[PDB]
Write a protein that binds this DNA or RNA. Structure first.
Ligand SMILES: [Ca+2]
Ligand SMILES: [Ca+2]
Ligand SMILES: [Ca+2]
Ligand SMILES: [Ca+2]
Length: 575
DNA sequence: ACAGGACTCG
DNA sequence: CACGAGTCCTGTAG
């Protein structure tokens, strides 16, 4: 029943200076993907245009790229990237309903117009799954079905903009959408489109080496088990360990990592199995899985950054996930050798905040002892050891620093004696003694942890530095485990989330500076608390001064932000 | 197709 | 594997 014009040519009344716009890409991965239809709703009416028509039309292309022609959209980054791949610029997106819904309630999991519309009780639009199907079944329907769905989405966007903006304003989140998340979305769209170049021969050679090691370790494991079995099967493995070999059952059977490390002394087989799984992971995911997704023409990978998924305001990255490339262990770290700059004589430059979370905590809690440590640029883990174990700097042993570091991680995650006990393999009572010593040395952090839990209870939510919000309705649960989990969220979310606001802001500031300096440098990746760029070799020295400074200056805290930076011919070398 | 259990990362 | 993510394999399922 929704009225529109199924236009067959583009007309001027479709080029109003305010419209809701739908540029539909049905494939889940939108990189180089078809645009299946276009709907426009504005003061003059509702329109559907076939894309071969509209995108071949120079006036429509000019309206798309005209920043004074304001568009309201859902997931403008998807339309933007798919248009970049056809060489078309999208500008003037003044309202993005996906990002508005995300700031209003990240727990909604809003992934289509219908889910966002639900939040204001607008129901005159169907969910995308209902129209398109699921997986194998996911298909573009016939024109009359397609066209009505797209026009309904655009009409929903047109109606919904105002109440969303009203709520964002009451929440004091209007600048967060307009000055942070929307500008960031255009930056992420450039990053994704630029992609990261992969050295595929280097990956194939690492793969060959791994297949050889895996073979030797597999053979060893069979020798030690006196049997053939599927090592990748936690079921078959648990039979081999706890039944055939009679190993102690400390925690059907669990063969997790924590468990196998405690088991390692009882039998040669355990360490071999842990080494197998680690290599098997490099092999299947970071060699095989990565090669499946590099473009065979350009040899680039083009991640998709999900800007509206995490509950704390962080990004995620998929297909591939470039925020979880190995680094911890040397053999996996070599994978980073396959990530190279995209031009001859360019280099990779990586800059990263040092302990941004603890620095945010110092600021938010205003703990005198913590703020002073950072003002002195002390090694925060050594200092925490000195305070909780009551010794001088030179009396801090490595084991002591290891344990104080675990307390610091605990503190930011929202501490509990059970979680620190499990992390450190000590008793609950032992872990509680450390936590008590910690709070005696940082009473501001204690005050803060108490206050933020009671504030989560009175307000129903907690906020970050730039007014991001997470609702915590389980904070009043009569169930202990559920309530504890919400209390940890209350303690952690302002910290993890504020660190996410700062880095997002640094990205915006950085991109403005690069353009103001007309440097060729550009962002490739964000990894939570670090930015990775490529640039000509000749820009390096300017980058060393410009990047850290932008990152350090993104916000003003009561403690300084510290940034280390490195560069080299591959991602691996930018260390 | 989907969950559980493993691994990766900040 | 505490807080926050994502991908691959196995085995059970339809
Ligand atoms: Ca024309
Ligand atoms: Ca980092
Ligand atoms: Ca400062
Ligand atoms: Ca790191």
């Amino acid at each position: 029943k929704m009225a529109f014009t199924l236009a067959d040519r583009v007309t001027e009344e479709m080029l109003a200076d305010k419209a809701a716009l739908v540029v539909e890409v049905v494939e889940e991965n939108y990189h180089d993907a078809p645009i299946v239809g276009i709907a426009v709703v504005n003061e003059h009416g509702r329109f559907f245009l076939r894309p071969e028509t509209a995108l071949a039309d120079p006036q429509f292309v000019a309206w798309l790229g005209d920043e004074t022609k304001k568009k309201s959209m859902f997931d403008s980054k998807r339309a933007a990237v798919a248009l970049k791949w056809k060489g078309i610029e999208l500008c003037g997106v003044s309202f993005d309903l996906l990002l508005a819904a995300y700031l209003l309630d990240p727990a909604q999991g809003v992934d289509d117009v219908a889910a966002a519309a639900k939040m204001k009780q607008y129901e005159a639009v169907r969910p995308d799954e209902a129209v398109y199907g699921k997986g194998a079944k996911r298909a573009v329907p016939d024109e009359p079905v397609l066209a009505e769905h797209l026009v309904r989405k655009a009409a929903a966007i047109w109606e919904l903009e105002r109440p969303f903006l009203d709520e964002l304003r009451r929440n004091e989140q209007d600048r967060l959408l307009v000055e942070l998340e929307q500008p960031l979305s255009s930056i992420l769209a450039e990053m994704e489109f630029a992609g990261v170049k992969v050295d595929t021969k280097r990956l194939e050679q690492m793969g060959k080496e791994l297949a050889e090691q895996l073979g030797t370790v597999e053979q060893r494991i069979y020798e030690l088990a006196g049997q053939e079995f599927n090592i990748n099967s936690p079921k078959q493995l648990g039979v081999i360990l706890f039944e055939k070999l009679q190993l102690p059952v400390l925690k059907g059977y669990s063969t997790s990592a924590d468990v196998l490390e405690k088991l390692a002394p009882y039998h040669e087989i355990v360490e071999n199995i842990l080494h197998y799984r680690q290599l098997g992971k490099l092999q299947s995911t970071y060699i095989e899985g990565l090669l499946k997704v590099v473009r065979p023409d350009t040899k680039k990978v083009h991640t998709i950054f999900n800007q509206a998924l995490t509950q704390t305001g962080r990004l995620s990255s998929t297909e591939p996930n470039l925020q979880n490339i190995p680094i911890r262990l040397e053999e996996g770290r070599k994978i980073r050798q396959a990530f190279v700059p995209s031009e001859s004589d360019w280099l990779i430059f990586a800059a990263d905040y040092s302990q941004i979370e603890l620095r945010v905590l110092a600021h938010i809690a205003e703990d005198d002892n913590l703020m002073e440590a950072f003002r002195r640029d002390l090694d925060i883990h050594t200092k925490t050891a000195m305070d909780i174990f009551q010794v001088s700097e030179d009396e801090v042993t490595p084991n002591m620093r290891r344990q104080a570091k675990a307390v610091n991680f605990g503190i930011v995650y929202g501490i509990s004696d059970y979680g620190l006990a499990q992390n450190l393999n000590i008793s609950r009572k032992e872990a509680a003694e450390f936590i008590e010593r910690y709070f005696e040395s940082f009473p501001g952090v204690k005050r803060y942890m108490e206050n933020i839990v009671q504030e989560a209870k009175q307000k129903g939510y907690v906020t970050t530095l730039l007014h991001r919000r997470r609702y915590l309705p389980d904070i009043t649960s009569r169930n202990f485990n559920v309530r504890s989990f919400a209390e940890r969220m209350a303690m952690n979310t302002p910290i993890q989330g504020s660190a996410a606001d700062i880095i997002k802001k640094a990205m915006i500031d950085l991109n403005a500076r690069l353009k103001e300096e007309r440097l060729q440098a550009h962002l490739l990746l964000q990894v939570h608390d670090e930015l990775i760029l490529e640039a000509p070799k000749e820009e390096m020295e300017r980058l060393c001064r410009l990047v850290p400074e932008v990152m350090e200056q993104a916000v003003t805290l009561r403690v300084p932000l510290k940034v280390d930076y490195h560069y080299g011919s591959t991602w691996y070398d930018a260390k």
